[PDB]
Amino acid sequence: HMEAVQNRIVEAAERVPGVRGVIHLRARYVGQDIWADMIIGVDPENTVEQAHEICEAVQAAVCGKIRRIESLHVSAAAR
Amino acid sequence: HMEAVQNRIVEAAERVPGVRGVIHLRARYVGQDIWADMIIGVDPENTVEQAHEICEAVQAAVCGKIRRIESLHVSAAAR
């Protein structure tokens, strides 16, 4: 059930230090696996490097909590 | 002729303060118009806000120089 999984993805991403909401999430099933692409909000005053670190942290947190995800790309934008 | 136009796009983007190369460019014709998506390199120590400013500057510079472009999305990544 896809919406239960999308809710978990958003919730997991929001628990990571430096996340200021989920701006966009597209998730699809490839068989029983999820492939997802996400855009997180960050403080516009973070550096590009810090934003990259937050994205990597989100990728790790979300993939760790949701075992069916087999591909997750995380980008950032000011909010 | 597409490659002449791609070269112009890259050259125009590289002339904008804060651009550290063109990491990716995908350009396609929709009729006689170009639709393009680009990723520029930036200083990892720029803020997210500064990176956004550079992207907007690139969009303005490239669209101003290359009149056939009707859609241009510019994102940034550390280099």
PDB file of C-alpha atoms in Angstrom:
ATOM      1  CA  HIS A   1       0.000   0.000   0.000  1.00  0.00           C
ATOM      2  CA  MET A   2       1.691   3.053  -1.443  1.00  0.00           C
ATOM      3  CA  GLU A   3       0.299   5.927   0.651  1.00  0.00           C
ATOM      4  CA  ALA A   4       1.296   4.276   3.954  1.00  0.00           C
ATOM      5  CA  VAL A   5       4.832   4.015   2.505  1.00  0.00           C
ATOM      6  CA  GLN A   6       4.845   7.671   1.345  1.00  0.00           C
ATOM      7  CA  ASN A   7       3.813   8.771   4.809  1.00  0.00           C
ATOM      8  CA  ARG A   8       6.623   6.802   6.337  1.00  0.00           C
ATOM      9  CA  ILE A   9       9.132   8.334   3.896  1.00  0.00           C
ATOM     10  CA  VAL A  10       8.057  11.878   4.792  1.00  0.00           C
ATOM     11  CA  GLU A  11       7.999  11.216   8.482  1.00  0.00           C
ATOM     12  CA  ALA A  12      11.452   9.625   8.417  1.00  0.00           C
ATOM     13  CA  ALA A  13      12.959  12.510   6.388  1.00  0.00           C
ATOM     14  CA  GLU A  14      11.424  15.133   8.768  1.00  0.00           C
ATOM     15  CA  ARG A  15      13.175  13.559  11.762  1.00  0.00           C
ATOM     16  CA  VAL A  16      16.649  14.343  10.312  1.00  0.00           C
ATOM     17  CA  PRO A  17      18.463  17.379  11.654  1.00  0.00           C
ATOM     18  CA  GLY A  18      18.365  20.237   9.111  1.00  0.00           C
ATOM     19  CA  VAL A  19      15.231  19.109   7.224  1.00  0.00           C
ATOM     20  CA  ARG A  20      12.666  21.889   6.809  1.00  0.00           C
ATOM     21  CA  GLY A  21       9.869  19.922   5.277  1.00  0.00           C
ATOM     22  CA  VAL A  22       9.536  17.670   2.275  1.00  0.00           C
ATOM     23  CA  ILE A  23       8.968  19.825  -0.817  1.00  0.00           C
ATOM     24  CA  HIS A  24       8.433  16.945  -3.265  1.00  0.00           C
ATOM     25  CA  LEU A  25       8.321  13.148  -3.216  1.00  0.00           C
ATOM     26  CA  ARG A  26       7.750  10.856  -6.169  1.00  0.00           C
ATOM     27  CA  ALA A  27       7.667   7.121  -5.305  1.00  0.00           C
ATOM     28  CA  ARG A  28       6.948   4.225  -7.594  1.00  0.00           C
ATOM     29  CA  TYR A  29       6.978   0.474  -7.370  1.00  0.00           C
ATOM     30  CA  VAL A  30       9.345  -1.587  -9.539  1.00  0.00           C
ATOM     31  CA  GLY A  31       7.999  -4.939  -8.598  1.00  0.00           C
ATOM     32  CA  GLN A  32       7.891  -5.130  -4.834  1.00  0.00           C
ATOM     33  CA  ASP A  33      10.653  -2.439  -4.511  1.00  0.00           C
ATOM     34  CA  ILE A  34      10.260   1.322  -4.184  1.00  0.00           C
ATOM     35  CA  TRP A  35      12.265   3.719  -6.315  1.00  0.00           C
ATOM     36  CA  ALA A  36      11.866   7.365  -5.040  1.00  0.00           C
ATOM     37  CA  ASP A  37      13.062  10.860  -5.751  1.00  0.00           C
ATOM     38  CA  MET A  38      12.725  13.564  -3.003  1.00  0.00           C
ATOM     39  CA  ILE A  39      13.395  17.304  -2.519  1.00  0.00           C
ATOM     40  CA  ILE A  40      13.885  18.486   1.075  1.00  0.00           C
ATOM     41  CA  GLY A  41      13.696  22.073   2.355  1.00  0.00           C
ATOM     42  CA  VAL A  42      16.828  23.483   4.088  1.00  0.00           C
ATOM     43  CA  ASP A  43      17.883  26.789   5.756  1.00  0.00           C
ATOM     44  CA  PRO A  44      18.953  29.083   2.825  1.00  0.00           C
ATOM     45  CA  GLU A  45      21.897  30.079   5.004  1.00  0.00           C
ATOM     46  CA  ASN A  46      23.311  26.535   5.135  1.00  0.00           C
ATOM     47  CA  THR A  47      26.262  26.020   2.828  1.00  0.00           C
ATOM     48  CA  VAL A  48      25.934  23.782  -0.288  1.00  0.00           C
ATOM     49  CA  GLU A  49      28.168  21.342   1.526  1.00  0.00           C
ATOM     50  CA  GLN A  50      25.888  21.268   4.583  1.00  0.00           C
ATOM     51  CA  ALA A  51      22.864  20.729   2.305  1.00  0.00           C
ATOM     52  CA  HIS A  52      24.625  17.793   0.702  1.00  0.00           C
ATOM     53  CA  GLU A  53      25.325  16.315   4.170  1.00  0.00           C
ATOM     54  CA  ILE A  54      21.659  16.668   5.134  1.00  0.00           C
ATOM     55  CA  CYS A  55      20.569  14.950   1.934  1.00  0.00           C
ATOM     56  CA  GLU A  56      22.933  12.056   2.592  1.00  0.00           C
ATOM     57  CA  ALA A  57      21.611  11.797   6.122  1.00  0.00           C
ATOM     58  CA  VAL A  58      18.051  11.700   4.860  1.00  0.00           C
ATOM     59  CA  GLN A  59      18.981   8.951   2.309  1.00  0.00           C
ATOM     60  CA  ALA A  60      20.568   6.863   5.093  1.00  0.00           C
ATOM     61  CA  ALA A  61      17.637   7.418   7.559  1.00  0.00           C
ATOM     62  CA  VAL A  62      14.866   6.725   5.091  1.00  0.00           C
ATOM     63  CA  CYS A  63      16.580   3.641   3.489  1.00  0.00           C
ATOM     64  CA  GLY A  64      17.288   2.305   6.993  1.00  0.00           C
ATOM     65  CA  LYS A  65      13.667   2.624   8.140  1.00  0.00           C
ATOM     66  CA  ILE A  66      11.938   1.524   4.970  1.00  0.00           C
ATOM     67  CA  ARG A  67      13.449  -1.714   3.796  1.00  0.00           C
ATOM     68  CA  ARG A  68      11.560  -1.955   0.489  1.00  0.00           C
ATOM     69  CA  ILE A  69      13.260   1.170  -0.908  1.00  0.00           C
ATOM     70  CA  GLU A  70      15.940   0.210  -3.395  1.00  0.00           C
ATOM     71  CA  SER A  71      16.649   3.556  -4.944  1.00  0.00           C
ATOM     72  CA  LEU A  72      16.379   6.983  -3.260  1.00  0.00           C
ATOM     73  CA  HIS A  73      17.677  10.273  -4.631  1.00  0.00           C
ATOM     74  CA  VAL A  74      17.535  13.278  -2.275  1.00  0.00           C
ATOM     75  CA  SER A  75      18.057  16.927  -3.350  1.00  0.00           C
ATOM     76  CA  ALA A  76      17.632  20.182  -1.385  1.00  0.00           C
ATOM     77  CA  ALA A  77      16.077  23.629  -1.936  1.00  0.00           C
ATOM     78  CA  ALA A  78      15.766  26.754   0.230  1.00  0.00           C
ATOM     79  CA  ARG A  79      12.747  27.061   2.502  1.00  0.00           C
TER      80      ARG A  79
ATOM     81  CA  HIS B   1      22.344  22.405 -35.450  1.00  0.00           C
ATOM     82  CA  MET B   2      22.219  21.124 -31.900  1.00  0.00           C
ATOM     83  CA  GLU B   3      25.899  20.836 -30.918  1.00  0.00           C
ATOM     84  CA  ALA B   4      26.650  24.463 -31.870  1.00  0.00           C
ATOM     85  CA  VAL B   5      23.746  25.439 -29.570  1.00  0.00           C
ATOM     86  CA  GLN B   6      24.999  23.215 -26.708  1.00  0.00           C
ATOM     87  CA  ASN B   7      28.415  24.809 -26.967  1.00  0.00           C
ATOM     88  CA  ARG B   8      26.895  28.238 -26.758  1.00  0.00           C
ATOM     89  CA  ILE B   9      24.855  27.237 -23.686  1.00  0.00           C
ATOM     90  CA  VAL B  10      27.955  25.981 -21.860  1.00  0.00           C
ATOM     91  CA  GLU B  11      30.046  28.943 -22.815  1.00  0.00           C
ATOM     92  CA  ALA B  12      27.360  31.401 -21.719  1.00  0.00           C
ATOM     93  CA  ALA B  13      26.851  29.645 -18.347  1.00  0.00           C
ATOM     94  CA  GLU B  14      30.652  29.584 -17.679  1.00  0.00           C
ATOM     95  CA  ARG B  15      30.858  33.370 -18.042  1.00  0.00           C
ATOM     96  CA  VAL B  16      28.564  33.920 -15.006  1.00  0.00           C
ATOM     97  CA  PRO B  17      30.200  34.785 -11.707  1.00  0.00           C
ATOM     98  CA  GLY B  18      30.158  31.769  -9.353  1.00  0.00           C
ATOM     99  CA  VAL B  19      29.893  29.053 -12.037  1.00  0.00           C
ATOM    100  CA  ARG B  20      32.468  26.284 -11.609  1.00  0.00           C
ATOM    101  CA  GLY B  21      31.799  24.333 -14.737  1.00  0.00           C
ATOM    102  CA  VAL B  22      28.747  22.759 -16.287  1.00  0.00           C
ATOM    103  CA  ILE B  23      28.195  19.336 -14.703  1.00  0.00           C
ATOM    104  CA  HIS B  24      25.264  18.297 -16.916  1.00  0.00           C
ATOM    105  CA  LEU B  25      23.252  19.694 -19.821  1.00  0.00           C
ATOM    106  CA  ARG B  26      20.332  18.038 -21.563  1.00  0.00           C
ATOM    107  CA  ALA B  27      18.877  20.033 -24.496  1.00  0.00           C
ATOM    108  CA  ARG B  28      16.136  19.017 -26.861  1.00  0.00           C
ATOM    109  CA  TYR B  29      14.192  20.604 -29.658  1.00  0.00           C
ATOM    110  CA  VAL B  30      10.415  21.072 -29.385  1.00  0.00           C
ATOM    111  CA  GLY B  31       9.868  22.282 -32.873  1.00  0.00           C
ATOM    112  CA  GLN B  32      12.294  25.095 -33.519  1.00  0.00           C
ATOM    113  CA  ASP B  33      12.585  25.855 -29.736  1.00  0.00           C
ATOM    114  CA  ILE B  34      15.082  24.474 -27.234  1.00  0.00           C
ATOM    115  CA  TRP B  35      13.982  23.100 -23.885  1.00  0.00           C
ATOM    116  CA  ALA B  36      17.042  22.463 -21.581  1.00  0.00           C
ATOM    117  CA  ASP B  37      17.897  21.287 -18.112  1.00  0.00           C
ATOM    118  CA  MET B  38      21.374  22.133 -16.637  1.00  0.00           C
ATOM    119  CA  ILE B  39      23.419  21.463 -13.469  1.00  0.00           C
ATOM    120  CA  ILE B  40      26.189  23.966 -12.681  1.00  0.00           C
ATOM    121  CA  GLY B  41      29.112  23.471 -10.283  1.00  0.00           C
ATOM    122  CA  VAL B  42      29.433  25.965  -7.371  1.00  0.00           C
ATOM    123  CA  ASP B  43      31.821  26.552  -4.409  1.00  0.00           C
ATOM    124  CA  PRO B  44      30.615  24.105  -1.661  1.00  0.00           C
ATOM    125  CA  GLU B  45      31.097  26.982   0.768  1.00  0.00           C
ATOM    126  CA  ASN B  46      28.501  29.188  -0.954  1.00  0.00           C
ATOM    127  CA  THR B  47      25.190  29.298   0.869  1.00  0.00           C
ATOM    128  CA  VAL B  48      22.069  27.635  -0.654  1.00  0.00           C
ATOM    129  CA  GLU B  49      20.771  31.135  -1.207  1.00  0.00           C
ATOM    130  CA  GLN B  50      23.907  32.176  -3.114  1.00  0.00           C
ATOM    131  CA  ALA B  51      23.654  29.009  -5.244  1.00  0.00           C
ATOM    132  CA  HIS B  52      20.075  29.891  -6.085  1.00  0.00           C
ATOM    133  CA  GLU B  53      21.182  33.411  -7.123  1.00  0.00           C
ATOM    134  CA  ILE B  54      23.884  31.968  -9.384  1.00  0.00           C
ATOM    135  CA  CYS B  55      21.384  29.627 -11.012  1.00  0.00           C
ATOM    136  CA  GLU B  56      19.008  32.508 -11.685  1.00  0.00           C
ATOM    137  CA  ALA B  57      21.863  34.501 -13.153  1.00  0.00           C
ATOM    138  CA  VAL B  58      22.797  31.628 -15.423  1.00  0.00           C
ATOM    139  CA  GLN B  59      19.123  31.274 -16.563  1.00  0.00           C
ATOM    140  CA  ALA B  60      18.989  35.005 -17.393  1.00  0.00           C
ATOM    141  CA  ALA B  61      22.416  35.011 -19.192  1.00  0.00           C
ATOM    142  CA  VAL B  62      21.823  31.901 -21.248  1.00  0.00           C
ATOM    143  CA  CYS B  63      18.187  32.811 -22.230  1.00  0.00           C
ATOM    144  CA  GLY B  64      19.392  36.310 -23.161  1.00  0.00           C
ATOM    145  CA  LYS B  65      22.173  35.042 -25.439  1.00  0.00           C
ATOM    146  CA  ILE B  66      20.362  32.138 -27.031  1.00  0.00           C
ATOM    147  CA  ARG B  67      17.025  33.313 -28.311  1.00  0.00           C
ATOM    148  CA  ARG B  68      15.680  29.897 -29.353  1.00  0.00           C
ATOM    149  CA  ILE B  69      15.622  28.628 -25.749  1.00  0.00           C
ATOM    150  CA  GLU B  70      12.085  28.619 -24.414  1.00  0.00           C
ATOM    151  CA  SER B  71      12.555  26.607 -21.279  1.00  0.00           C
ATOM    152  CA  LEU B  72      15.698  26.428 -19.100  1.00  0.00           C
ATOM    153  CA  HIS B  73      15.953  24.894 -15.640  1.00  0.00           C
ATOM    154  CA  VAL B  74      19.238  25.443 -13.769  1.00  0.00           C
ATOM    155  CA  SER B  75      20.283  23.565 -10.586  1.00  0.00           C
ATOM    156  CA  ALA B  76      23.594  23.574  -8.669  1.00  0.00           C
ATOM    157  CA  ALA B  77      25.933  21.013  -7.064  1.00  0.00           C
ATOM    158  CA  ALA B  78      29.246  21.282  -5.193  1.00  0.00           C
ATOM    159  CA  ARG B  79      32.453  21.188  -7.213  1.00  0.00           C
TER     160      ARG B  79
END
